[PDB]
Amino acid sequence: DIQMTQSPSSLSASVGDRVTITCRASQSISSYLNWFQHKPGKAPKLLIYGASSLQSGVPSRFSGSGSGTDFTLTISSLQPEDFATYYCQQSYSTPPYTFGQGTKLEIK
C-alpha cells in the first residue's frame, strides 16, 4: 500500500508573503504526484500534474518540486484569491489514485 502525510494543516500569511506546503509518501513513487486546488464553493481544479510540470492556464506563481518520497509546492506571491484546500495525489502505487488529507490555507 501507500500512505501520504501532510506535515502542515493550516497556514497563515499575508498578501505579500511566500508559503510552502509539503507532502510525504510512505515509499518512493518516482515523482508521480499531482497537486490539486479545491475552492470550497466551486469544483476543485488541478494545479500541478507530474512532479514539476505546470498545467496550462494557471499563473506561474505556483511551483512544484521534489522527487522520491517527499514533494513540495510553493507560492511566491499569494494573490488574494489563493484561498482553497490543497491536495497531493499519487498515481504510481497499486492503490489507485489515493489522495492525501486536506491542507487549509488562510491569509492574515
Binding site: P59, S60, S65, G68
Partner: protein, 49 residues
C-alpha cells in the same frame, strides 16, 4: 504578469531527485600564446646539451 523577475531561488533538499541534487561545476579555460607560458606542469628540468 507581463513583468517577471528572472531571478529565482533553488529548492535544494537532502532528498530531492538524483538529477535534482545540486552539483558544483568549474570550467577551466586555457589559452596558449607566444608569450612565455606561466602555468606549467610538474615535469622537472634537466641540463641542456
Amino acid at each position: 504578469f507581463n513583468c517577471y523577475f528572472p531571478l529565482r531561488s533553488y529548492s535544494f533538499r537532502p532528498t530531492y531527485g538524483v538529477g535534482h541534487q545540486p552539483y558544483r561545476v568549474v570550467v577551466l579555460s586555457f589559452e596558449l600564446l607566444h608569450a612565455p607560458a606561466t602555468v606549467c606542469g610538474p615535469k622537472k628540468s634537466t641540463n641542456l646539451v
